[PDB]
Write an enzyme that holds these catalytic residues in place. Structure first.
Site, PDB file in Angstrom:
ATOM      1  N   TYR A  55      -5.254   4.057  -4.656  1.00 50.54           N
ATOM      2  CA  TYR A  55      -5.469   3.012  -3.663  1.00 50.54           C
ATOM      3  C   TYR A  55      -6.587   2.065  -4.127  1.00 50.54           C
ATOM      4  O   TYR A  55      -6.481   0.866  -3.959  1.00 50.54           O
ATOM      5  CB  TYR A  55      -5.790   3.622  -2.295  1.00 50.54           C
ATOM      6  CG  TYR A  55      -6.181   2.600  -1.261  1.00 50.54           C
ATOM      7  CD1 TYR A  55      -5.220   1.917  -0.538  1.00 50.54           C
ATOM      8  CD2 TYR A  55      -7.510   2.289  -1.026  1.00 50.54           C
ATOM      9  CE1 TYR A  55      -5.569   0.966   0.408  1.00 50.54           C
ATOM     10  CE2 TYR A  55      -7.877   1.336  -0.090  1.00 50.54           C
ATOM     11  CZ  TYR A  55      -6.903   0.668   0.629  1.00 50.54           C
ATOM     12  OH  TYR A  55      -7.250  -0.268   1.560  1.00 50.54           O
ATOM     13  N   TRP A  77      -8.880  11.831   4.566  1.00 48.64           N
ATOM     14  CA  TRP A  77      -8.572  11.017   3.388  1.00 48.64           C
ATOM     15  C   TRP A  77      -9.797  10.977   2.465  1.00 48.64           C
ATOM     16  O   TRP A  77      -9.647  11.092   1.246  1.00 48.64           O
ATOM     17  CB  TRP A  77      -8.086   9.614   3.783  1.00 48.64           C
ATOM     18  CG  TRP A  77      -7.411   8.877   2.664  1.00 48.64           C
ATOM     19  CD1 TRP A  77      -6.076   8.834   2.373  1.00 48.64           C
ATOM     20  CD2 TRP A  77      -8.063   8.075   1.665  1.00 48.64           C
ATOM     21  NE1 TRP A  77      -5.855   8.059   1.264  1.00 48.64           N
ATOM     22  CE2 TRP A  77      -7.054   7.578   0.809  1.00 48.64           C
ATOM     23  CE3 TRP A  77      -9.396   7.728   1.420  1.00 48.64           C
ATOM     24  CZ2 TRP A  77      -7.344   6.755  -0.280  1.00 48.64           C
ATOM     25  CZ3 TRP A  77      -9.680   6.915   0.345  1.00 48.64           C
ATOM     26  CH2 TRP A  77      -8.668   6.436  -0.490  1.00 48.64           C
ATOM     27  N   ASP A  93      -7.997  11.039  10.364  1.00 45.89           N
ATOM     28  CA  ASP A  93      -7.288  10.676   9.113  1.00 45.89           C
ATOM     29  C   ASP A  93      -8.296  10.155   8.073  1.00 45.89           C
ATOM     30  O   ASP A  93      -8.368  10.697   6.970  1.00 45.89           O
ATOM     31  CB  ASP A  93      -6.174   9.652   9.361  1.00 45.89           C
ATOM     32  CG  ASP A  93      -5.311   9.366   8.138  1.00 45.89           C
ATOM     33  OD1 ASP A  93      -5.827   8.735   7.185  1.00 45.89           O
ATOM     34  OD2 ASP A  93      -4.125   9.779   8.144  1.00 45.89           O
ATOM     35  N   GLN A 127     -10.874  12.593  -1.997  1.00 49.01           N
ATOM     36  CA  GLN A 127     -11.516  12.000  -3.185  1.00 49.01           C
ATOM     37  C   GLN A 127     -12.405  13.036  -3.890  1.00 49.01           C
ATOM     38  O   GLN A 127     -12.784  12.817  -5.036  1.00 49.01           O
ATOM     39  CB  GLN A 127     -12.365  10.786  -2.791  1.00 49.01           C
ATOM     40  CG  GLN A 127     -11.604   9.712  -2.021  1.00 49.01           C
ATOM     41  CD  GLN A 127     -10.454   9.129  -2.807  1.00 49.01           C
ATOM     42  OE1 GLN A 127     -10.606   8.714  -3.954  1.00 49.01           O
ATOM     43  NE2 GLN A 127      -9.283   9.082  -2.191  1.00 49.01           N
ATOM     44  N   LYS A 133       3.583   4.287   8.656  1.00 52.27           N
ATOM     45  CA  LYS A 133       2.315   4.557   7.982  1.00 52.27           C
ATOM     46  C   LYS A 133       1.604   3.233   7.678  1.00 52.27           C
ATOM     47  O   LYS A 133       0.453   3.060   8.052  1.00 52.27           O
ATOM     48  CB  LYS A 133       2.521   5.380   6.708  1.00 52.27           C
ATOM     49  CG  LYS A 133       1.253   5.646   5.904  1.00 52.27           C
ATOM     50  CD  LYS A 133       1.009   4.655   4.781  1.00 52.27           C
ATOM     51  CE  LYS A 133      -0.076   5.104   3.830  1.00 52.27           C
ATOM     52  NZ  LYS A 133      -0.264   4.138   2.723  1.00 52.27           N
ATOM     53  N   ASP A 187       0.885   9.977   4.525  1.00 54.43           N
ATOM     54  CA  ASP A 187       0.895   9.603   3.099  1.00 54.43           C
ATOM     55  C   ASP A 187       1.031  10.890   2.275  1.00 54.43           C
ATOM     56  O   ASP A 187       1.604  11.867   2.775  1.00 54.43           O
ATOM     57  CB  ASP A 187      -0.324   8.736   2.753  1.00 54.43           C
ATOM     58  CG  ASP A 187      -1.691   9.405   2.862  1.00 54.43           C
ATOM     59  OD1 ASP A 187      -1.745  10.627   2.986  1.00 54.43           O
ATOM     60  OD2 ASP A 187      -2.703   8.684   2.825  1.00 54.43           O
ATOM     61  N   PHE A 244      -1.917   8.651   9.273  1.00 58.71           N
ATOM     62  CA  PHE A 244      -1.127   7.829   8.368  1.00 58.71           C
ATOM     63  C   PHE A 244      -0.444   8.753   7.359  1.00 58.71           C
ATOM     64  O   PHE A 244      -1.092   9.198   6.418  1.00 58.71           O
ATOM     65  CB  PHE A 244      -2.039   6.808   7.690  1.00 58.71           C
ATOM     66  CG  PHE A 244      -2.943   6.066   8.641  1.00 58.71           C
ATOM     67  CD1 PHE A 244      -2.424   5.403   9.742  1.00 58.71           C
ATOM     68  CD2 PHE A 244      -4.312   6.011   8.426  1.00 58.71           C
ATOM     69  CE1 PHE A 244      -3.255   4.712  10.607  1.00 58.71           C
ATOM     70  CE2 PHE A 244      -5.138   5.314   9.292  1.00 58.71           C
ATOM     71  CZ  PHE A 244      -4.610   4.671  10.382  1.00 58.71           C
ATOM     72  N   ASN A 270       0.859  -1.197   0.000  1.00 58.63           N
ATOM     73  CA  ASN A 270       0.000   0.000   0.000  1.00 58.63           C
ATOM     74  C   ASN A 270       0.896   1.249   0.000  1.00 58.63           C
ATOM     75  O   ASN A 270       1.123   1.869   1.059  1.00 58.63           O
ATOM     76  CB  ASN A 270      -1.003  -0.022   1.159  1.00 58.63           C
ATOM     77  CG  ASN A 270      -1.861   1.224   1.233  1.00 58.63           C
ATOM     78  OD1 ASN A 270      -1.912   1.995   0.280  1.00 58.63           O
ATOM     79  ND2 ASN A 270      -2.533   1.426   2.357  1.00 58.63           N
TER      80      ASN A 270
END
Length: 319
Positions: free
Chosen positions: A89, A298, A294, A302, A195, A227, A225, A68
């Site tokens: 992802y 996250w 998170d 999108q 992460k 990223d 996390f 990932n």
């Protein structure tokens, strides 16, 4: 105090950072808006992933989070699955699902241990090529080897030894599986991120619905996390601010080298951006765990408007 050590080690970075800072006014404003809308905590979408019994599903989550990382690049890597196009992802998730459904034994340590470039090229076949194809094959072979040699092919054995501690499991995973050792050095000091290992805990929690292998008593200890999508959202929301050189590098889609001061500063400020936002929400009667904040950010990542500053592009094994 801080068993995990991600908060402690990253605070050093945030205090000294030259290219990134946190705007605490943006934190407040965003905390106010999210508390007013009473934002529902997101839930783990099991429908988008492969499903099975505890043994194979535990192994599946390990494999998922082992590879990932790092989906960006031109021409954009996309896959087609059941008449729908996926990238990022979601292309990873759909790819593994497609392969498992078609009888590729991706949950068997025996298969993982001997997987090659050719097998991985097939699993992720689509438009373009998944970045870091050779490194993904090497990591999956490591993951299978260790699984077979140390845990009798069952990730469930590792999870059990954690004793329902998220922190304990991160320690077990990072020690046993070197690919998950997501640490950096900033001004002569170790910085802990973890992460993939941390997102692995939240995936177990999700997939197992807080039961059995997904039961954890200290999920509060998980951080954000660190990223490339979460910092992008934080910047969009005004929480992260960048010095002009770094801003321009992001705008121009210029690679930001892994282990560089700028990369470590973005990741550290991500951790503390989320933590400051969590604190600010608690203040206003809306208590969430860092990992939930998170998931929440996250999600927004999108739905970003066009003209949003592009996410930072680092070639790396850790995110």
């Amino acid at each position: 105090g801080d068993r995990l050590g991600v908060l402690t080690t990253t605070r050093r970075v945030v205090e000294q950072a030259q290219a990134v800072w946190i705007d605490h006014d943006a934190v407040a404003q965003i905390a106010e808006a999210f508390a007013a809308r009473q934002v529902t905590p997101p839930t783990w979408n099991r429908e988008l992933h492969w499903s099975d019994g505890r043994e194979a599903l535990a192994n599946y989550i390990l494999v998922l989070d082992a590879v990932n990382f790092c989906f960006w690049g031109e021409p954009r890597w996309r896959i087609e699955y059941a008449g729908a196009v996926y990238d990022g992802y979601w292309a990873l998730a759909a790819s593994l699902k497609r392969a498992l459904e078609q009888g590729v034994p991706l949950t068997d340590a025996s298969y993982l241990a001997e997987i090659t470039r050719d097998d991985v090229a097939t699993i992720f076949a689509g438009e373009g090529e998944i970045p870091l194809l050779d490194e993904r094959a090497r990591i999956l072979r490591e993951t299978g080897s260790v699984l077979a040699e140390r845990f009798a092919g069952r990730f469930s054995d590792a999870i059990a030894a954690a004793g329902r501690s998220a922190v304990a499991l991160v320690d077990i995973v990072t020690n046993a599986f070197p690919s998950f050792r997501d640490v950096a050095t900033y001004r002569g000091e170790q910085v802990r991120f973890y992460k993939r290992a941390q997102i692995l805990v939240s995936d177990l929690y999700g997939a197992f619905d807080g039961s059995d292998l997904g039961a954890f008593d200290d999920l509060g200890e998980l951080t954000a996390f660190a990223d490339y999508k979460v910092p992008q959202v934080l910047h969009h929301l005004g929480i992260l601010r960048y010095a002009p050189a770094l801003h321009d590098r992001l705008a121009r889609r210029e690679e930001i080298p892994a282990g560089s001061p700028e990369e470590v500063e973005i990741r550290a400020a991500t951790i503390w951006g989320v933590e400051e936002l969590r604190r600010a929400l608690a203040s206003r009667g809306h208590a969430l765990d860092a990992y939930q904040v998170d998931w929440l950010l996250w999600d927004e990542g999108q739905r970003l408007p066009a003209g949003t500053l592009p996410y930072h592009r680092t070639r790396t094994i850790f995110y």
